[PDB]
Amino acid sequence: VSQLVDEIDRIASQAEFNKMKLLTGAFARLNPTASMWFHIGANMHQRERVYIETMNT
Amino acid sequence: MIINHNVSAIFAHRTLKSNDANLSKDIEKLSSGMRINKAGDDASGLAVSEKMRTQIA
User: Fold this and answer.
1) A-B interface: how many C-beta pairs under 8 angstroms?
2) By three-state DSSP, how is residue A38 classified?
3) What family, per the record (chain B) (predicted)?
């Protein structure tokens, strides 16, 4: 169990895309450090928010 | 008609050079299979791809 719980924390801190951590709670909803927006248009205000919640032990 | 200057031929060759330039930039991609082969096509896109290749290897 100590081995399994250790791996989950290891995954959360090391889940990274383009030098950005995802599963550590960076992009949560309540208290996020960074807010993720995707550009899906050719105009000024075509933006939709993305949430990735905290997934540590 | 003015015979000492051929403006209509000038427009023909000036457009010819530009179309000849873009044609050469497309042989590279088809012969290689990669959209970006030299800098200038997309500076940010080339940089992000190399950082991804760091993770892949």
Assistant:
1) 4
2) strand
3) Belongs to the bacterial flagellin family.
